[PDB]
Amino acid sequence: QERRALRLGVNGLPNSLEPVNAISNVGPRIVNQIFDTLIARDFFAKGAPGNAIDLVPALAESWERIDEKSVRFKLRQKVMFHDGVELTADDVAYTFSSERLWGPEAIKKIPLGKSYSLDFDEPVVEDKYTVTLRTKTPSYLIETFVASWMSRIVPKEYYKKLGAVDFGNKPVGTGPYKFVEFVAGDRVVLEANDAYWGPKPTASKITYQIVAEPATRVAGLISGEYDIITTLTPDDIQLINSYPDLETRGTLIENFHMFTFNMNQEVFKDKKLRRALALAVNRPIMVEALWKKQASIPAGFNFPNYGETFDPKRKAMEYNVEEAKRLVKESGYDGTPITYHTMGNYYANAMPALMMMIEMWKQIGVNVVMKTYAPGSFPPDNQTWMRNWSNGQWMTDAYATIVPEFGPNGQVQKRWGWKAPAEFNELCQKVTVLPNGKERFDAYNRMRDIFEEEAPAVILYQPYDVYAARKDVHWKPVSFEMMEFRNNLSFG
Numbered sequence: 001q002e003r004r005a006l007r008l009g010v011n012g013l014p015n016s017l018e019p020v021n022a023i024s025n026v027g028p029r030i031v032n033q034i035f036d037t038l039i040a041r042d043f044f045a046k047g048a049p050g051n052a053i054d055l056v057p058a059l060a061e062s063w064e065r066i067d068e069k070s071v072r073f074k075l076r077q078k079v080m081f082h083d084g085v086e087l088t089a090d091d092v093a094y095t096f097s098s099e100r101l102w103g104p105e106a107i108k109k110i111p112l113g114k115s116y117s118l119d120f121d122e123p124v125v126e127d128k129y130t131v132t133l134r135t136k137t138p139s140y141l142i143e144t145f146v147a148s149w150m151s152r153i154v155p156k157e158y159y160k161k162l163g164a165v166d167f168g169n170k171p172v173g174t175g176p177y178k179f180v181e182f183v184a185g186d187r188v189v190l191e192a193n194d195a196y197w198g199p200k201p202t203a204s205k206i207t208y209q210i211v212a213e214p215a216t217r218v219a220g221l222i223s224g225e226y227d228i229i230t231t232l233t234p235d236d237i238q239l240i241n242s243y244p245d246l247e248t249r250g251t252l253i254e255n256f257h258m259f260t261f262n263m264n265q266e267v268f269k270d271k272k273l274r275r276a277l278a279l280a281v282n283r284p285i286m287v288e289a290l291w292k293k294q295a296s297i298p299a300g301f302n303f304p305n306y307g308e309t310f311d312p313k314r315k316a317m318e319y320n321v322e323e324a325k326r327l328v329k330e331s332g333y334d335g336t337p338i339t340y341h342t343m344g345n346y347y348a349n350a351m352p353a354l355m356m357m358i359e360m361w362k363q364i365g366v367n368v369v370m371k372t373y374a375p376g377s378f379p380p381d382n383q384t385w386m387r388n389w390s391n392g393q394w395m396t397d398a399y400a401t402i403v404p405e406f407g408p409n410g411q412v413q414k415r416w417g418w419k420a421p422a423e424f425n426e427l428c429q430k431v432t433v434l435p436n437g438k439e440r441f442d443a444y445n446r447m448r449d450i451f452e453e454e455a456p457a458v459i460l461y462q463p464y465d466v467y468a469a470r471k472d473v474h475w476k477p478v479s480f481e482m483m484e485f486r487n488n489l490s491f492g
């Protein structure tokens with residue numbers, strides 16, 4: 001009869017379906033279905049196992065870089081939003097506007113819009129199907145930005161009429177799946193958009209059902225309640241793979257798990273204790289015990305997806321228990337227990353990783369205690385000391401995420417109080433405008449050195465993202481924190 005409905009058991013849900021505000025480990029797998037971008041990354045180009053870097057036309061049928069500051073897009077014609085309104089350059093201009101995204105006025109609507117954006121100038125609408133995106137200063141990052149999760153295309157009139165909050169609860173996009181319902185902290189339901197411009201949706205419906213406990217998620221797959229489950233650990237591989245009708249599907253993703261600090265707190269204003277905690281983390285033993293060797297430990301804030309700004313000659317991050325003990329003493333730390341906030345196992349292995357780290361920190365003379373918090377119940381900033389986090393490396397360049405998250409205009413310095421050395425912020429400003437070359441390459445290596453010296457966050461590893469699925473549900477994971485169903489979902 002009708003197509004099969006897809007049932008997903010997920011680790012968590014975003015609090016909003018507004019595509020920029022949905023940026024997280026849990027939002028993109030949903031908003032990738034509701035929306036489209038001008039340029040799309042094709043993870044399966046030339047038979048790649050879901051990790052190809054190839055950029056292909058999407059809402060823009062073609063594009064041309066004009067100069068060091070601008071890129072002109074030719075829009076695909078007769079593309080319709082879910083409410084029937086035709087996609088125009090007006091919708092694109094609005095998506096990348098000062099008003100909605102990067103200007104001072106957008107900070108209330110999209111709190112991280114300005115900090116995550118390029119140094120944009122107002123878009124230029126040439127005609128109904130022609131729009132130029134430009135920057136005030138040189139930027140060779142326009143293309144990678146436009147293909148990213150910052151750039152899902154929103155409908156101007158409908159978005160303006162509802163406002164960013166109401167739009168977030170009733171999204172309208174051009175994507176293969178349209179909005180049905182959103183029960184905050186419970187479920188999101190989408191249905192097939194059969195008016196879709198690209199590959200027709202193969203599922204009649206998609207339900208993202210929150211299953212916070214991974215053991216309950218695994219039981220749900222074994223019982224036949226879910227078709228695909230997310231955010232498992234390599235420790236679940238043996239059991240699931242013992243069921244002949246189920247299997248695990250995993251891949252290393254372009255993201256790093258970390259722990260970070262509220263540097264507005266007295267104990268973390270200075271770098272000494274941040275550094276002591278960083279120097280005591282035995283990453284290889286965590287990777288062996290919890291990840292069955294599947295996770296990858298980077299040589300600093302440095303990843304292969306950065307391409308020309310990836311440094312393959314970089315030394316491993318320091319591990320020095322004896323130096324850590326000496327820093328604990330010099331910091332003046334008195335033995336008072338320091339809290340570490342985690343949203344249960346929102347991050348695969350969050351609590352087992354923390355338990356191991358608590359033990360490593362006991363050995364250097366620092367008492368760390370776990371504090372759990374329910375989905376969407378993140379405690380006030382001044383109630384937090386240490387906390388876990390992750391960063392999706394969302395550009396084919398080193399700019400992201402060191403500059404958008406840890407730069408002078410970023411939330412780590414502004415909200416979380418990192419007093420970054422003046423040199424670090426000078427380098428951030430330089431890498432933003434410089435073209436690729438020796439000067440830019442060396443500036444990112446100096447920024448990586450300062451990042452390790454300062455420890456505003458401590459990089460753990462790139463997780464091996466593990467899903468489990470029914471063998472009769474054909475779907476391949478991609479090397480990013482999202483799920484792709486276009487030409488990548490079939491049943492039987």
Ligand SMILES: C[C@H](OP(=O)(O)O[C@@H]1[C@@H](O)[C@H](O)[C@@H](CO)O[C@H]1O)C(O)O
Binds near residue numbers: 392
């Ligand atoms: C607690 C959640 O954070 P999560 O680690 O899931 O997502 C990060 C995101 O915060 C960050 O802006 C981007 C780019 O650095 O990477 C995402 O992985 C929050 O965003 O809902």
Ligand code: NA
Binds near residue numbers: 201
């Ligand atoms: Na499809």
